[PDB]
Write an enzyme that holds these catalytic residues in place. Structure first.
Site, PDB file in Angstrom:
ATOM      1  N   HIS A 288      -4.985   0.291  -4.832  1.00  5.41           N
ATOM      2  CA  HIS A 288      -6.339  -0.415  -4.195  1.00  5.41           C
ATOM      3  C   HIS A 288      -7.350   1.253  -4.724  1.00  5.41           C
ATOM      4  CE1 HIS A 288      -3.599  -2.714  -1.918  1.00  5.41           C
ATOM      5  NE2 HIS A 288      -3.695  -3.839  -2.769  1.00  5.41           N
TER       6      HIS A 288
ATOM      7  N   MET B 146     -10.257   1.423  -2.198  1.00  9.95           N
ATOM      8  CA  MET B 146      -9.323   2.749  -0.546  1.00  9.95           C
ATOM      9  C   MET B 146      -8.530   3.757  -0.708  1.00  9.95           C
ATOM     10  SD  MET B 146      -5.650   0.264   0.914  1.00  9.95           S
ATOM     11  CE  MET B 146      -5.203   0.800   2.564  1.00  9.95           C
TER      12      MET B 146
ATOM     13  N   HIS C  49       0.619  -1.186   0.345  1.00 10.41           N
ATOM     14  CA  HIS C  49      -0.015  -0.004  -0.126  1.00 10.41           C
ATOM     15  C   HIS C  49       0.353   0.827  -0.135  1.00 10.41           C
ATOM     16  CE1 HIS C  49      -3.564  -2.312   1.399  1.00 10.41           C
ATOM     17  NE2 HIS C  49      -2.602  -2.306   2.626  1.00 10.41           N
TER      18      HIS C  49
ATOM     19  N   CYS D 127      -4.511   5.108  -1.541  1.00 10.16           N
ATOM     20  CA  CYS D 127      -3.672   3.996  -1.722  1.00 10.16           C
ATOM     21  C   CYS D 127      -3.542   3.700  -3.255  1.00 10.16           C
ATOM     22  CB  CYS D 127      -4.447   2.834  -0.997  1.00 10.16           C
ATOM     23  SG  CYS D 127      -3.039   1.388  -1.792  1.00 10.16           S
TER      24      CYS D 127
HETATM   25 CU   LIG Z   1      -3.152  -0.442  -0.853  1.00  9.01          CU
END
Ligand SMILES: [Cu+2]
Ligand SMILES: [Ca+2]
Length: 98
Positions: A86, A91, A38, A83
């Protein structure tokens, strides 16, 4: 100071909590938890005036459980962040600095 987990313990691709409220000057500790890698990228379009998104972002990936990125925020307002790997899975998060 406060802690935001990157990934829920269940493996869900989310920042926990999604919306965090802190007082100006507190340090936010982003802790790698599940579903990594991440990173933490602040959105230029959703940060207070005068704040530099690049300067406070962690572009380089966090790869290991417990790996932490800490950043102190001082300017009052809202800070949207996400992130990169993601963002499509939703995210994204927000920090409200009082
Ligand atoms: Cu992530
Ligand atoms: Ca939450």
């Amino acid at each position: 100071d406060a802690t935001v987990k990157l990934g829920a313990d269940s493996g869900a691709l989310e920042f926990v909590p999604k919306t965090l409220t802190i007082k100006s000057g507190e340090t936010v500790n982003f802790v790698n938890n599940a579903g990594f890698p991440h990173n933490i990228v602040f959105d230029e379009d959703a940060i207070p005036s005068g704040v530099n998104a690049d300067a406070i972002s962690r572009d380089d990936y966090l790869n290991a459980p417990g790996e932490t990125y800490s950043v102190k925020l001082t300017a009052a307002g809202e800070y949207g962040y996400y992130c990169e790997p993601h963002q499509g899975a939703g995210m994204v998060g927000k920090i409200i600095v009082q």
